[PDB]
Amino acid sequence: XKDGLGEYTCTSLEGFE
Amino acid sequence: KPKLLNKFDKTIKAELDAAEKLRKRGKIEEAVNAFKELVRKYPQSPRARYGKAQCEDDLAEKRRSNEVLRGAIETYQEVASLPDVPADLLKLSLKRRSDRQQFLGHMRGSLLTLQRLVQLFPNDTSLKNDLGVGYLLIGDNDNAKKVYEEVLSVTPNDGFAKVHYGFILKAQNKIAESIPYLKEGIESGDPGTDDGRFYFHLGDAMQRVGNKEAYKWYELGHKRGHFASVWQRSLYNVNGLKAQPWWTPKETGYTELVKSLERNWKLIRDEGLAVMDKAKGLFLPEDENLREKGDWSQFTLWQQGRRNENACKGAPKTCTLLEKFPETTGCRRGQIKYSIMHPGTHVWPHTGPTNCRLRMHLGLVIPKEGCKIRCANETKTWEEGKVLIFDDSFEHEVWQDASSFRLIFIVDVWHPELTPQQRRSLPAI
Ligand SMILES: O=C(O)CNC(=O)C(=O)O
Ligand SMILES: [Mn+2]
């Protein structure tokens, strides 16, 4: 997330972009 | 070996192998034209359809095209609609569909795919494990939890389901309850359990409860390549960046930003205070389960390099001031936010997601005593009108034991050693 690391994924995937 | 040919396909196995041999040989263009002809001659063929989709898949990788890949994703589904499709071929086609759907960021789509898979193969535990991940990737920890509970009621010693169950538990603040699943799940060595997320949250869970064996797991996580060190436990990292808990303004090279924050600090304060007085609703309670106790809120001007326009209408001169500094407004892995903490607040030792940012704190209202911040092995205090700079990918801890409220301004910057291309390419956090 923002201040910590409590979510499974933080980034978004966009194929090959 | 898998059984991918129904009796109908066995009557054309020769043409099928010829097309597949082209693709396996690497001649993708003419292999696509082969399977396209085969789908043309035999629209009812599941193998011809699957080979078409694999070739489209291979073509997308070659051309690096998402659009081509979305074609393959639709073709993988058509395989499922054709007559008398072998189970192995069906599972293989819908799994690759889901995998490619995730690759493109179509997580809702991958979810529907995984849901259909689970119904077609209710005894396949792996498809349930994959379904749970589908729910996690969307943020639906409730349905995800149910899935892994339904897995462990059948296969209770599956480590993959254990670590994911414990992760969901700690996310829900079930600290003590998550430790065994996370621990046992890592101790199994199952595929998918060697994930830095579980080492991270296992150890942190132990810390909160007092189990001093936590750093034994942090060290292990460092041995397996998850953490750059036992103290710097971020997971979204660019390797090679200078790593130290506390920086000086000169060390960052962002000296004009530091000067501008310190020289205009009263302006930054007053606009923050005005939002507190006339719009407390813009200050949001900390919602990452980082507090042991107390009141902690944050008013965010920038996130992921996006300017929050309504927030900046409440602190307009501060936002204008900051626009001259893309090193922070363009930092798509940090924020710009005011942060207020009231007396009686202890913040758990925690770490940020990424080592690609450095964190400036500008003191705005600092009670004479009671407030301090630890990063790694150094504890410091804030000063009104002064900037501190630490790397929040290192473990850090905060106490507010004062008589009145404490306000700071938090300004994240790109790690100075990051190149301009990395500052434009790294995915946002
Ligand atoms: O804002 C505060 O009082 C505490 N700050 C943090 O934990 C941080 O900036 O990473
Ligand atoms: Mn923090």
Residue numbers in the entry:
A (entry chain C): 253 to 269
B (entry chain A): 330 to 758
Sentences from the paper on this structure:
Here, we report crystallographic and biochemical results on the structure and substrate selectivity of AspH. The results reveal a key role for the TPR domain of AspH in substrate binding and, unexpectedly, that the preferred EGFD-substrates of AspH have a non-canonical (Cys3–4) disulfide pattern. Whilst the oxygenase domain fold of AspH is typical for the 2OG oxygenase superfamily, details of its active site and the role of the TPR domain in EGFD-substrate binding are remarkable. Whatever the precise extent of conformational changes during catalysis, the results reveal a central role for the TPR domain in enabling AspH catalysis—without it, 2OG turnover occurs, but EGFDs are not hydroxylated.
A structure of AspH co-crystallised with the CP101–119 (AspH-TPR-Ox:CP101–119) reveals this substrate bound to one of the two AspH molecules in the asymmetric unit (chain A).
